[PDB]
């Protein structure tokens, strides 16, 4: 069972928890990073309104501009997940 | 000198070329992926108006929603670069 480590968040605690749950579901169902990212993005578009963006991977850096209170960057096990709405 | 391979683009040829030039400049100046991404994002915010987002790395998948004609995904050498405006 994969360890969640939230690295940077500008997001309600309830939503941070959902992101972690959603990513857990995604990793259960899918093995390919883009499919994992697509599942998370789509769940959040639904649960929390569009428009979300998701990057999933083991090696990347980013510079994104996000809407306040709609950004999370976390690890689920060995995989890093960036999920946010654009600012 | 690093080989540019554009993998997916919804973007004018002039802008695709600028993205490749910008990423080339970034890789000359910086070694860390987030710094490379920040340099590209900032150049495009300036040259082509906000709001851009940039991910740079060797291992990641993504699902993002972009504005039509403002998306490029390419490699510069071994590094993958995702650059886009949000749709």
């Amino acid at each position: 069972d994969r360890k969640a480590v939230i690295k940077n968040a500008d997001m309600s605690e309830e939503m941070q928890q959902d992101a972690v749950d959603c990513a857990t579901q995604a990793l259960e169902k899918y093995n390919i990073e883009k499919d994992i990212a697509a599942y998370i993005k789509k769940e959040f578009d639904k649960k929390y309104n569009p428009t979300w963006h998701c990057i999933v991977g083991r090696n990347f850096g980013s510079y994104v501009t996000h809407e306040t209170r709609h950004f999370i960057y976390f690890y689920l096990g060995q995989v890093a997940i960036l999920l946010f709405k654009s600012g | 000198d690093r080989k540019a391979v554009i993998k997916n683009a919804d973007m004018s040829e002039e802008m695709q070329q600028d993205a490749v030039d910008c990423a080339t400049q970034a890789l000359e100046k910086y070694n860390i992926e987030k710094d490379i991404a920040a340099y590209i994002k900032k150049e495009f915010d300036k040259k082509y108006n906000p709001t851009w987002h940039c991910i740079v790395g060797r291992n990641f998948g993504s699902y993002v929603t972009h504005e039509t004609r403002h998306f490029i995904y390419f490699y510069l050498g071994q590094v993958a670069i995702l650059l886009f405006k949000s749709g």
Partner: peptide
């Protein structure tokens, strides 16, 4: 706001 992320690996 704009922020950076960088993977540990």
């Amino acid at each position: 706001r704009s922020t950076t992320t960088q993977t540990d690996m």
